[PDB]
């Protein structure tokens, strides 16, 4: 086994607080915010060797992203931005990096108590989303 293992499993979304400014200074569209703050997703992590998957499920859409620690790869997100990530493990926190068009932004995974807590940080805004076990 590895650390990486609290992490694995298949968590739901209990909370989310500040998402749709944290959206906005990302430079995401009204409608797409709309749509996207309505969702409800499902976080499923796996680990096969060092691959690393993180797949986001809702009725909506769902997306998936594969990668190795400290590697950076290509992602297109949910809200169709095309960036280069690199993720890595710092004291038990995965950092996820994005960067596109000039801009970056980091989304921190940690595992606190029963939940898993996603904190995504844009310029001064900070949004909370709280998933648990499913
Ligand atoms: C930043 C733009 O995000 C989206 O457009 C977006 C989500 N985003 C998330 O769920 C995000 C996170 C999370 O809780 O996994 C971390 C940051 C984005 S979830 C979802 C969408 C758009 C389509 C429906 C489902």
Redesign the pocket.
């Known amino acids: 086994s590895h650390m990486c293992d609290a992490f694995v499993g298949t968590w739901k979304?209990v909370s989310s607080e500040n998402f749709d400014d944290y959206?906005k200074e990302?430079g995401?569209g009204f409608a797409?915010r709309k749509?996207?703050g309505m969702?409800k997703?499902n976080?499923i992590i796996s680990v096969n060797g060092d691959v690393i998957t993180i797949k986001?499920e809702?009725t909506?859409?769902n997306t998936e992203i594969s990668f190795i620690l400290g590697q950076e790869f290509d992602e297109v997100?949910?809200?169709d931005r095309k960036v280069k990530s690199t993720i890595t493990l710092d004291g038990g926190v995965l950092v996820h990096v994005q960067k596109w068009d000039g801009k970056s932004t980091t989304?921190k995974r940690k595992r606190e108590d029963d939940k898993l807590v996603?904190e995504?940080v844009m310029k001064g805004v900070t949004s909370t989303?709280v998933y648990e076990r499913a």
């Open positions: 979304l959206m990302v995401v797409t749509v996207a969702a997703p976080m986001s809702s909506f859409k997100t949910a809200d989304i996603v995504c989303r």
